[PDB]
Design a protein around this ligand. Structure first.
Ligand code: MAC
Length: 197
């Protein structure tokens, strides 16, 4: 449900084939928030419970609303927490395909961490989904250093954070249908592109 720590808790000797690391939006609960659980249930349908590990970014990422105003759209401590999870995935399960996502402040955190990641780990992320991406205008819909074909951005018309503002309007809270269908559909397709099936 809203907290998932499958990577931290998982046995190295029985690594999942796919590891999904997700960062929640500002003020959301657990480490998956409102959208993460919907994506998680559909990835489990696709690869089976033992086939995919779901890991939210918890720890130092407090998802404080005010940190949306910092340079990278989140704090340095939160970025360090998410890279540490990617370094644990790469050490614990070196053959797993990685996929990732973030909502709102968590989308800026996701993009900032990918930009700073060692390229051998970054290149294992087969696909990333970003909802209400707070740096959408500033980064021109891209994640720095990461291919456009592996990126999918969900930015609703009227969601002012996609158009360079930090105002929270009702379309920013309307990503539920995307998290239920198109975003897991994109992630599963990108994993099967490289893994076959
Ligand atoms: C989507 C993502 O993980 O960025 Hg470090």
């Amino acid at each position: 449900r809203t907290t998932r720590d499958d990577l931290i808790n998982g046995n190295s000797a029985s690594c999942a084939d796919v590891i999904f690391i997700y960062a929640r939006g500002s003020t959301e609960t657990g480490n998956l928030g409102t959208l993460g659980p919907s994506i998680a249930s559909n990835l489990e349908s696709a690869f089976g419970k033992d086939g995919v590990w779901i890991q939210g970014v918890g720890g130092a990422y407090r998802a404080t609303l005010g940190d949306n105003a910092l340079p990278r759209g989140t704090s340095s401590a939160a970025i360090r927490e998410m890279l540490g999870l990617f370094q644990q995935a790469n050490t614990k399960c070196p053959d797993a395909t990685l996929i990732a996502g973030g909502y709102s402040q968590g989308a800026a955190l996701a993009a900032a961490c990918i930009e700073d990641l060692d390229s051998a780990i970054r290149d294992k992320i087969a696909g990333t989904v970003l909802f209400g991406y707070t740096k959408n205008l500033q980064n021109r819909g891209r994640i720095p250093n990461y291919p456009a074909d592996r990126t999918k951005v969900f930015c609703n018309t009227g969601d002012l954070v996609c158009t360079g503002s930090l105002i929270v309007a009702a379309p920013h809270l309307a990503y539920g249908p995307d998290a239920r269908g198109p975003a897991p559909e994109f992630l599963i397709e990108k994993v099967r592109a490289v893994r076959g099936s």
